[PDB]
Amino acid sequence: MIKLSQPTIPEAAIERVSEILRSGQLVHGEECESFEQELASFLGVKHALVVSNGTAALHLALLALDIGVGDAVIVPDFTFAATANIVEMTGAKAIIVDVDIETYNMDSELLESCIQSWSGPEKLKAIMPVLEFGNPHGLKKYREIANKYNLALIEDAACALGAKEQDVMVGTVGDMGCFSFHPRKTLTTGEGGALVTNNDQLYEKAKLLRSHGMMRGEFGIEFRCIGLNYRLTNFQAAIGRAILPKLNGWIERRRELATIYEDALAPLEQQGLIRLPKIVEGHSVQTYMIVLSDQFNRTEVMKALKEGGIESSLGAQSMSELKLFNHDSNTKSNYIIGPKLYIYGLALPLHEHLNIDDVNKITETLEQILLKL
Amino acid sequence: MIKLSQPTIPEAAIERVSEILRSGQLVHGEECESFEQELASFLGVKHALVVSNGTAALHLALLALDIGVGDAVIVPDFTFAATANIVEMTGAKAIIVDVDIETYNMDSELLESCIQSWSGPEKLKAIMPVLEFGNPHGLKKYREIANKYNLALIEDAACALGAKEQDVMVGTVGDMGCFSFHPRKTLTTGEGGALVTNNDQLYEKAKLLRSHGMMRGEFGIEFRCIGLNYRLTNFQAAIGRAILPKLNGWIERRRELATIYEDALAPLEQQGLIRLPKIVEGHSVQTYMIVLSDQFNRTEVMKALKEGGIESSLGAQSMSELKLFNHDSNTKSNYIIGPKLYIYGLALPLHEHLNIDDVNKITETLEQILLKL
Ligand SMILES: O=S(=O)(O)CCN1CCCN(CCS(=O)(=O)O)CC1
Ligand SMILES: O=S(=O)(O)CCN1CCCN(CCS(=O)(=O)O)CC1
Ligand SMILES: Cc1ncc(COP(=O)(O)O)c(CN)c1O
Ligand SMILES: Cc1ncc(COP(=O)(O)O)c(CN)c1O
Ligand SMILES: [Cl-]
Ligand SMILES: [Cl-]
Ligand SMILES: [Mg+2]
Ligand SMILES: [Mg+2]
């Protein structure tokens, strides 16, 4: 069976976890610290904090900006539910904006238009666009728009560690940026994430919030404010540190497999049967998602791929369709693209241990399903 | 150097983590499921959920009971800050009650008296007593009091997995009970925790909240409500599963070391120089904390123990002294015991790899410091 994801943990990391478990510095230590330094260096960004998961990064980003009851944040319609959920868990309201059919990312024009017509009652405080599947496209526009309207930008870069927006690493443009190390992502620590920022107060506040408001004072550990526990373990950090220096190379290989998909599938796209993703420069290809034409039933397609030894899945959800984010501004809007991607979007296997023969088999099987051969 | 804590990870668990990392079922799986079943069986309780840490268990317990803005929860003055912090992170207010000089646990009489004189404005919804250091004493009284006043009981059993209140396992008396698997605790998963309950709706709600409101529906995974990510990894769960069948035995050995401390130190207690903890039946001895007399400076004692090759620390904090929990009801109360334990309480090494000679060395060194020999 060709699998969607096969997490790759280097043997050196496995040995290192063993050493840690046996010695027994388990809690956040020199491994987390070093992982943060290496993440910061990788990204070109002043600060990193590793945390329990990608949702925690988002959560701390909201909390550090003091976003909560009375406030509003704009989220894309197409994403994993965490993006909108985590906004509402603070008390704020998730205001949904549709995404663009080509990028699968928040539509910058709908975004600006949503801001201009905003009528409260809550105060709009941030934009939380998703760089979906590792796609950076739109990011500079989101920044430009956020500044024009005096809003914070929080990058939900869950899927985009290693993606690059022209000259600038994804995650480093927002006031803060957030990454997931969930096993479906390309660097995984099983569960894990990171919150990054160029802002010292946001960093220091998130860091207090991450660990019970603890910081170092003259006579020892001080408790300066209320907080949570969103710490990552030292052995998880070690896992991540071993993957990070391989990550760019892994991404390069993924872009090469995407080239293979694109050329093999281009005729099906020509015939109007599928829409292929635009893998722009700096796309990290965390996911390769096509869109099935209208005529097809994704459930049947997936079944027939599975019978041919190929895994597939939906790409992401439609937040409007979940019916959980019920600000009047959402119920009075109309969403077109996100709901379509939710039903017709089909992720195909693309990871570190697929080769050209695997992709040829996948595309031939797709062909035979769609064209009936 | 004799150490306060030396986390014990069995070699079988280490190998199992390796297998998991290499195979790569990383996210919550059959290991978490099984760990929950074994925890439930160990405790005699209907439901367990493993979670990222002990603070997360507490958090989910609050959220599952719908505790937040407008609400109040009673917490002990002597505990780790998470207990009070996590109440306030929901929007509720932490109402502090002093603890008892012998048990280090919430004073049941001050508790009841705090309820009787409560004057809002918030609605009092719960009691969150701490079974501090693994001490069960008071637990049935907390239940009795909670029922009399129609309040939920949430056990902060962070430190008390394996402790027993007469016939009944700690954690199984509250509407919910919460455990930490932090490395200072006797079973550790590096970071980890569990939320347990005999109530099906609280279990089902916490479980939705733990993972983005996900549950199983006829055509697949459904998103039924907003939630968080508080999942534990499959490999962490494996660690915990390997420790749990050893835990009772580990506790028995700890009670035996406590016997040794008690007899070696009893003269110092006789002379009024220290107060020894009362290790009642069912105390899991997560921590052995003495209280220094007035005359002594704990900082100097700790320094001199360290120079004699012995680690020590404070036991816990005073919530009133942190000045973070500022409901009028707290600022107009007076706390006696918690503030004293905060300054005079001294934890001494007691874990799986200390022997009688280690304890004899510790108590002789203490003796020579206090009596100046
Ligand atoms: O697609 S296959 O599974 O048939 C072969 C994939 N190869 C296996 C060898 C590791 N890696 C080299 C990169 S690194 O050493 O991990 O940085 C390239 C990916
Ligand atoms: O105190 S010492 O470090 O000198 C010796 C401690 N022993 C080491 C042997 C493991 N265990 C047996 C219990 S179990 O097999 O882990 O369940 C008892 C604790
Ligand atoms: C866009 C997006 N945002 C947020 C998250 C949440 O990250 P985590 O799973 O690490 O909690 C995910 C997880 N797949 C995601 O894809
Ligand atoms: C009484 C108490 N409550 C809550 C916690 C929080 O648990 P965790 O460290 O697993 O987040 C601790 C941690 N030592 C604790 O001792
Ligand atoms: Cl190849
Ligand atoms: Cl011995
Ligand atoms: Mg060991
Ligand atoms: Mg492997």
Short mmCIF file of N, CA and C in Angstrom, two decimals, chain A residues 23-139:
data_model
loop_
_atom_site.label_atom_id
_atom_site.label_comp_id
_atom_site.label_asym_id
_atom_site.label_seq_id
_atom_site.Cartn_x
_atom_site.Cartn_y
_atom_site.Cartn_z
N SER A 23 19.34 8.41 30.66
CA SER A 23 19.98 9.37 31.54
C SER A 23 18.92 10.03 32.40
N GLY A 24 17.96 10.64 31.69
CA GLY A 24 16.74 11.14 32.29
C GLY A 24 16.73 12.65 32.53
N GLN A 25 17.31 13.49 31.64
CA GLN A 25 16.80 14.86 31.54
C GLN A 25 15.61 14.91 30.57
N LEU A 26 14.39 14.80 31.13
CA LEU A 26 13.19 14.62 30.32
C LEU A 26 12.48 15.94 29.99
N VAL A 27 12.39 16.85 30.97
CA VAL A 27 11.63 18.09 30.82
C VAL A 27 12.42 19.04 29.90
N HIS A 28 11.74 20.06 29.34
CA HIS A 28 12.37 21.07 28.49
C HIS A 28 13.78 21.38 29.02
N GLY A 29 14.80 21.13 28.18
CA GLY A 29 16.17 21.43 28.57
C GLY A 29 17.03 21.95 27.42
N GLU A 30 18.32 21.62 27.48
CA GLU A 30 19.29 22.13 26.53
C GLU A 30 18.91 21.70 25.10
N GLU A 31 18.11 20.65 24.99
CA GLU A 31 17.66 20.16 23.69
C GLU A 31 16.58 21.10 23.12
N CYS A 32 15.65 21.57 23.95
CA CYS A 32 14.64 22.51 23.53
C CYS A 32 15.27 23.85 23.17
N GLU A 33 16.16 24.32 24.06
CA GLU A 33 16.89 25.57 23.89
C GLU A 33 17.63 25.57 22.56
N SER A 34 18.40 24.52 22.32
CA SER A 34 19.18 24.41 21.11
C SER A 34 18.25 24.32 19.91
N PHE A 35 17.15 23.58 20.03
CA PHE A 35 16.20 23.44 18.93
C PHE A 35 15.64 24.81 18.61
N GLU A 36 15.35 25.63 19.62
CA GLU A 36 14.86 26.96 19.36
C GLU A 36 15.89 27.82 18.61
N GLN A 37 17.16 27.75 19.03
CA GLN A 37 18.23 28.50 18.39
C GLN A 37 18.37 28.08 16.93
N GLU A 38 18.29 26.78 16.66
CA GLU A 38 18.48 26.28 15.32
C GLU A 38 17.29 26.67 14.45
N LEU A 39 16.08 26.68 15.04
CA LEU A 39 14.90 27.09 14.31
C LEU A 39 15.03 28.56 13.96
N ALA A 40 15.51 29.34 14.92
CA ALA A 40 15.60 30.76 14.68
C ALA A 40 16.60 31.01 13.55
N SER A 41 17.70 30.27 13.54
CA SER A 41 18.77 30.45 12.57
C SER A 41 18.28 30.01 11.19
N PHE A 42 17.56 28.88 11.17
CA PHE A 42 16.96 28.38 9.96
C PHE A 42 16.00 29.40 9.34
N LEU A 43 15.22 30.08 10.19
CA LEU A 43 14.17 30.95 9.70
C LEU A 43 14.67 32.38 9.42
N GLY A 44 15.76 32.78 10.08
CA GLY A 44 16.26 34.15 10.04
C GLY A 44 15.45 35.06 10.94
N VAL A 45 15.06 34.52 12.09
CA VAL A 45 14.09 35.20 12.92
C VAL A 45 14.68 35.29 14.32
N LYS A 46 14.23 36.27 15.10
CA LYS A 46 14.91 36.60 16.33
C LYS A 46 14.59 35.55 17.39
N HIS A 47 13.36 35.05 17.44
CA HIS A 47 12.97 34.21 18.55
C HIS A 47 12.15 33.02 18.08
N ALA A 48 12.44 31.85 18.69
CA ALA A 48 11.60 30.66 18.62
C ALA A 48 11.31 30.09 20.01
N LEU A 49 10.08 29.55 20.17
CA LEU A 49 9.63 28.79 21.32
C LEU A 49 9.02 27.48 20.83
N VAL A 50 9.55 26.35 21.28
CA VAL A 50 8.91 25.09 20.95
C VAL A 50 7.88 24.81 22.02
N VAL A 51 6.83 24.12 21.58
CA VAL A 51 5.59 24.00 22.33
C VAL A 51 4.97 22.64 21.99
N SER A 52 3.90 22.31 22.72
CA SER A 52 3.34 20.97 22.69
C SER A 52 2.83 20.57 21.31
N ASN A 53 2.34 21.53 20.53
CA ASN A 53 1.76 21.23 19.22
C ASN A 53 1.50 22.53 18.46
N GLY A 54 1.00 22.44 17.23
CA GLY A 54 0.81 23.62 16.42
C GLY A 54 -0.36 24.48 16.91
N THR A 55 -1.38 23.82 17.49
CA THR A 55 -2.51 24.53 18.05
C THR A 55 -2.05 25.38 19.24
N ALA A 56 -1.17 24.83 20.08
CA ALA A 56 -0.63 25.59 21.18
C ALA A 56 0.12 26.84 20.71
N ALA A 57 0.85 26.74 19.58
CA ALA A 57 1.58 27.90 19.08
C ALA A 57 0.60 29.03 18.77
N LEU A 58 -0.45 28.69 18.00
CA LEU A 58 -1.53 29.59 17.65
C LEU A 58 -2.15 30.19 18.92
N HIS A 59 -2.40 29.35 19.91
CA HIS A 59 -3.07 29.76 21.13
C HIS A 59 -2.23 30.81 21.85
N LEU A 60 -0.94 30.53 21.97
CA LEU A 60 -0.03 31.44 22.67
C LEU A 60 0.13 32.74 21.91
N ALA A 61 0.04 32.65 20.58
CA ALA A 61 0.13 33.85 19.75
C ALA A 61 -1.07 34.73 20.05
N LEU A 62 -2.28 34.15 20.08
CA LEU A 62 -3.47 34.90 20.45
C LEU A 62 -3.31 35.50 21.85
N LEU A 63 -2.91 34.68 22.82
CA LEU A 63 -2.85 35.13 24.20
C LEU A 63 -1.78 36.20 24.34
N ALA A 64 -0.66 36.08 23.64
CA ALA A 64 0.39 37.06 23.82
C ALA A 64 -0.05 38.43 23.28
N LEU A 65 -0.95 38.45 22.30
CA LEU A 65 -1.44 39.70 21.73
C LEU A 65 -2.66 40.17 22.50
N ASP A 66 -2.99 39.46 23.57
CA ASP A 66 -4.12 39.83 24.39
C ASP A 66 -5.43 39.78 23.58
N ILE A 67 -5.65 38.70 22.83
CA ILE A 67 -6.86 38.54 22.06
C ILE A 67 -7.79 37.58 22.78
N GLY A 68 -9.07 37.96 22.89
CA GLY A 68 -10.01 37.21 23.70
C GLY A 68 -11.44 37.72 23.52
N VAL A 69 -12.23 37.65 24.59
CA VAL A 69 -13.60 38.16 24.62
C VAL A 69 -13.61 39.61 24.14
N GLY A 70 -14.57 39.93 23.26
CA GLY A 70 -14.70 41.27 22.71
C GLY A 70 -13.95 41.46 21.40
N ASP A 71 -13.15 40.47 20.99
CA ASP A 71 -12.25 40.61 19.85
C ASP A 71 -12.64 39.68 18.71
N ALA A 72 -12.07 40.00 17.54
CA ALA A 72 -12.31 39.23 16.34
C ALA A 72 -11.00 39.02 15.58
N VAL A 73 -10.94 37.84 14.93
CA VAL A 73 -9.83 37.44 14.10
C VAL A 73 -10.35 36.84 12.79
N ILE A 74 -9.73 37.21 11.68
CA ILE A 74 -10.08 36.66 10.38
C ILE A 74 -9.26 35.41 10.06
N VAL A 75 -9.98 34.36 9.65
CA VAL A 75 -9.44 33.05 9.34
C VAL A 75 -9.92 32.65 7.95
N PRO A 76 -9.19 31.78 7.23
CA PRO A 76 -9.61 31.36 5.90
C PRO A 76 -10.71 30.31 6.03
N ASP A 77 -11.54 30.15 5.00
CA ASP A 77 -12.58 29.13 5.05
C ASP A 77 -11.96 27.75 4.92
N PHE A 78 -10.87 27.63 4.18
CA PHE A 78 -10.28 26.33 3.93
C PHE A 78 -9.03 26.17 4.79
N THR A 79 -9.08 25.25 5.75
CA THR A 79 -7.99 24.98 6.68
C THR A 79 -8.41 23.81 7.55
N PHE A 80 -7.53 23.41 8.46
CA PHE A 80 -7.91 22.48 9.51
C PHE A 80 -8.64 23.27 10.59
N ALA A 81 -9.56 22.64 11.32
CA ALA A 81 -10.50 23.32 12.18
C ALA A 81 -9.80 24.07 13.29
N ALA A 82 -8.59 23.61 13.68
CA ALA A 82 -7.84 24.23 14.76
C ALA A 82 -7.73 25.74 14.55
N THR A 83 -7.53 26.18 13.30
CA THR A 83 -7.27 27.59 13.01
C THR A 83 -8.41 28.45 13.56
N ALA A 84 -9.66 28.10 13.25
CA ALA A 84 -10.83 28.82 13.73
C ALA A 84 -11.15 28.47 15.18
N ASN A 85 -11.10 27.18 15.53
CA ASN A 85 -11.35 26.75 16.89
C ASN A 85 -10.51 27.55 17.87
N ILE A 86 -9.23 27.72 17.58
CA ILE A 86 -8.35 28.19 18.64
C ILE A 86 -8.65 29.67 18.91
N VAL A 87 -9.06 30.39 17.88
CA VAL A 87 -9.53 31.75 18.05
C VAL A 87 -10.72 31.78 19.01
N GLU A 88 -11.70 30.90 18.81
CA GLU A 88 -12.89 30.93 19.63
C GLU A 88 -12.62 30.41 21.04
N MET A 89 -11.61 29.56 21.24
CA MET A 89 -11.32 29.07 22.59
C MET A 89 -10.84 30.22 23.48
N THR A 90 -10.32 31.32 22.90
CA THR A 90 -9.91 32.47 23.69
C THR A 90 -11.10 33.36 24.05
N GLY A 91 -12.26 33.16 23.43
CA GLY A 91 -13.38 34.08 23.61
C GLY A 91 -13.62 34.99 22.41
N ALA A 92 -12.59 35.19 21.58
CA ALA A 92 -12.72 35.95 20.36
C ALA A 92 -13.62 35.22 19.37
N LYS A 93 -13.88 35.86 18.23
CA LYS A 93 -14.76 35.31 17.23
C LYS A 93 -13.99 35.14 15.92
N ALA A 94 -14.24 34.02 15.28
CA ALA A 94 -13.53 33.71 14.07
C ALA A 94 -14.37 34.25 12.92
N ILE A 95 -13.81 35.16 12.14
CA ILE A 95 -14.51 35.77 11.01
C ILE A 95 -13.93 35.13 9.76
N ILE A 96 -14.78 34.49 8.95
CA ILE A 96 -14.26 33.66 7.89
C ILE A 96 -14.23 34.42 6.59
N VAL A 97 -13.15 34.18 5.84
CA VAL A 97 -12.97 34.72 4.51
C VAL A 97 -12.63 33.57 3.58
N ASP A 98 -13.18 33.65 2.37
CA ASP A 98 -13.02 32.58 1.40
C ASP A 98 -11.57 32.57 0.95
N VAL A 99 -11.18 31.46 0.31
CA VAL A 99 -9.84 31.28 -0.23
C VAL A 99 -9.92 31.32 -1.76
N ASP A 100 -8.72 31.37 -2.36
CA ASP A 100 -8.49 31.48 -3.79
C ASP A 100 -8.35 30.08 -4.40
N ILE A 101 -9.00 29.87 -5.55
CA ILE A 101 -9.10 28.56 -6.21
C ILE A 101 -7.73 28.00 -6.62
N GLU A 102 -6.73 28.86 -6.84
CA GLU A 102 -5.44 28.42 -7.37
C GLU A 102 -4.45 28.08 -6.25
N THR A 103 -4.42 28.93 -5.21
CA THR A 103 -3.44 28.82 -4.13
C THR A 103 -3.96 27.98 -2.95
N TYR A 104 -5.28 27.93 -2.79
CA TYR A 104 -5.96 27.38 -1.63
C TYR A 104 -5.75 28.26 -0.38
N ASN A 105 -5.24 29.50 -0.56
CA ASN A 105 -4.96 30.40 0.53
C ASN A 105 -5.98 31.54 0.59
N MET A 106 -6.09 32.18 1.75
CA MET A 106 -6.99 33.31 1.93
C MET A 106 -6.88 34.27 0.74
N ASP A 107 -8.04 34.59 0.16
CA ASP A 107 -8.16 35.51 -0.96
C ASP A 107 -7.93 36.95 -0.48
N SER A 108 -6.84 37.58 -0.92
CA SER A 108 -6.43 38.86 -0.33
C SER A 108 -7.48 39.94 -0.55
N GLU A 109 -8.20 39.87 -1.68
CA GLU A 109 -9.20 40.87 -2.02
C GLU A 109 -10.45 40.72 -1.16
N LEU A 110 -10.91 39.48 -0.97
CA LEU A 110 -12.02 39.23 -0.07
C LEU A 110 -11.61 39.65 1.35
N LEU A 111 -10.32 39.48 1.68
CA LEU A 111 -9.81 39.82 2.99
C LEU A 111 -10.00 41.32 3.22
N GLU A 112 -9.46 42.11 2.30
CA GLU A 112 -9.50 43.55 2.48
C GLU A 112 -10.95 44.01 2.52
N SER A 113 -11.78 43.41 1.68
CA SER A 113 -13.17 43.82 1.60
C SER A 113 -13.91 43.46 2.89
N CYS A 114 -13.52 42.34 3.51
CA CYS A 114 -14.09 41.97 4.80
C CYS A 114 -13.71 43.00 5.87
N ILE A 115 -12.46 43.47 5.85
CA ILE A 115 -12.07 44.48 6.82
C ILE A 115 -12.86 45.78 6.62
N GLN A 116 -13.01 46.24 5.37
CA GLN A 116 -13.61 47.53 5.07
C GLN A 116 -15.07 47.57 5.50
N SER A 117 -15.76 46.44 5.38
CA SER A 117 -17.17 46.40 5.73
C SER A 117 -17.40 45.90 7.15
N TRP A 118 -16.35 45.70 7.94
CA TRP A 118 -16.52 45.18 9.29
C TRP A 118 -17.37 46.17 10.09
N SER A 119 -18.34 45.66 10.85
CA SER A 119 -19.24 46.54 11.60
C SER A 119 -19.36 46.11 13.06
N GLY A 120 -18.32 45.48 13.59
CA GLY A 120 -18.34 45.03 14.97
C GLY A 120 -19.43 43.98 15.20
N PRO A 121 -19.93 43.83 16.45
CA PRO A 121 -19.55 44.69 17.57
C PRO A 121 -18.14 44.53 18.15
N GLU A 122 -17.53 43.37 17.94
CA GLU A 122 -16.21 43.06 18.49
C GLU A 122 -15.18 43.95 17.81
N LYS A 123 -14.03 44.12 18.45
CA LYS A 123 -12.92 44.78 17.79
C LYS A 123 -12.07 43.79 16.99
N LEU A 124 -11.89 44.08 15.70
CA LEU A 124 -11.06 43.28 14.82
C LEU A 124 -9.61 43.50 15.22
N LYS A 125 -8.87 42.44 15.61
CA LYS A 125 -7.51 42.62 16.11
C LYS A 125 -6.48 41.92 15.23
N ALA A 126 -6.88 40.87 14.50
CA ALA A 126 -5.86 40.18 13.75
C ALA A 126 -6.38 39.49 12.51
N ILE A 127 -5.39 39.21 11.66
CA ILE A 127 -5.54 38.31 10.55
C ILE A 127 -4.68 37.07 10.79
N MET A 128 -5.30 35.90 10.64
CA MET A 128 -4.62 34.64 10.82
C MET A 128 -4.80 33.84 9.54
N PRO A 129 -4.08 34.21 8.45
CA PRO A 129 -4.09 33.44 7.21
C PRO A 129 -3.32 32.14 7.38
N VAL A 130 -3.67 31.14 6.57
CA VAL A 130 -3.00 29.85 6.57
C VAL A 130 -2.14 29.75 5.33
N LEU A 131 -0.87 29.35 5.49
CA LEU A 131 -0.06 29.06 4.33
C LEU A 131 -0.24 27.58 4.01
N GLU A 132 -1.34 27.31 3.31
CA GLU A 132 -1.91 25.97 3.29
C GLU A 132 -1.07 25.04 2.42
N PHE A 133 -0.78 23.87 2.97
CA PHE A 133 0.01 22.85 2.32
C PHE A 133 1.45 23.29 2.07
N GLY A 134 1.89 24.40 2.68
CA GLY A 134 3.24 24.87 2.46
C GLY A 134 3.34 25.94 1.38
N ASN A 135 2.18 26.47 0.98
CA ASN A 135 2.10 27.45 -0.09
C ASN A 135 2.29 28.84 0.50
N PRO A 136 3.36 29.57 0.12
CA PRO A 136 3.58 30.90 0.67
C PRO A 136 2.76 31.98 -0.01
N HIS A 137 2.15 31.66 -1.16
CA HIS A 137 1.62 32.73 -1.99
C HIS A 137 0.51 33.48 -1.27
N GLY A 138 0.66 34.82 -1.25
CA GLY A 138 -0.27 35.75 -0.62
C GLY A 138 0.33 36.45 0.60
N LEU A 139 1.41 35.90 1.14
CA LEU A 139 1.88 36.28 2.47
C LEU A 139 2.24 37.76 2.54
#
